[PDB]
């Protein structure tokens, strides 16, 4: 395998490898980032549920530290988040994380 | 089908159903509850990535 796929422990497969790295390590690197930034505020850019799935570690990450986070969605097939840009303009947020194509 | 499974948009098939209630409508019914309850904060007990 190359990318991410879901592999529950309920499946007990043997003969498979993946070439994707560890998302929880990615989340830990983002933790190291934002705590080096000392931010108590962050903002998620996503479009899919799947990116949220793969980065749900960062969703549970404010257990160790008080930080308010905003997680709102791109246009799914159209490509104009300038309404969402004006949304975050009223959202007044500047500490923004990006994952998309 | 009965269970929810993921059906993406680029999943562009034609021959499928599921009797499953839609997550947004479920979530918004929960919103109706909480807006009937006027809550400032919340806490989810949940299973997994689903």
From Swiss-Prot, chain B:
It comes from the Eukaryota. Expressed in the olfactory bulb (at protein level). Expressed in the deep cortical layers, dentate gyrus, reticular thalamic nucleus, mammillary bodies, pons, and cerebellum of the adult. It is found in: Cell membrane; Postsynaptic cell membrane. Mass spectrometry data suggest the protein is N-glycosylated at five distinct sites. Homotetramer, and heterotetramer with GRIK4 or GRIK5. Can form functional heteromeric receptors with GRIK2. Interacts with PRKCABP. Interacts with NETO2. Belongs to the glutamate-gated ion channel (TC 1.A.10.1) family. GRIK3 subfamily. The postsynaptic actions of Glu are mediated by a variety of receptors that are named according to their selective agonists. This receptor binds domoate > kainate >> L-glutamate = quisqualate >> AMPA = NMDA. Ionotropic glutamate receptor that functions as a cation-permeable ligand-gated ion channel, gated by L-glutamate and the glutamatergic agonist kainic acid. Binding of the excitatory neurotransmitter L-glutamate induces a conformation change, leading to the opening of the cation channel, and thereby converts the chemical signal to an electrical impulse. The receptor then desensitizes rapidly and enters a transient inactive state, characterized by the presence of bound agonist. This is Glutamate receptor ionotropic, kainate 3. It comes from Rattus norvegicus (Rat).
């Amino acid at each position: 395998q190359l990318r991410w796929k879901h592999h529950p422990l309920d499946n007990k497969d043997t003969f498979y490898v993946n070439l994707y790295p560890d998302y929880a390590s990615l989340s830990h690197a983002i933790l190291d980032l934002v705590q080096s930034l000392k931010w108590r505020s962050a903002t998620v850019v996503y479009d899919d549920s799947t990116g949220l799935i793969r980065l749900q570690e960062l969703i549970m990450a404010p257990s160790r530290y008080n930080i308010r986070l905003k997680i709102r969605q791109l246009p799914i097939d159209s490509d104009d988040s300038r309404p969402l840009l004006k949304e975050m303009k009223r959202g007044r947020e500047f500490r923004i994380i990006f994952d998309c194509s």
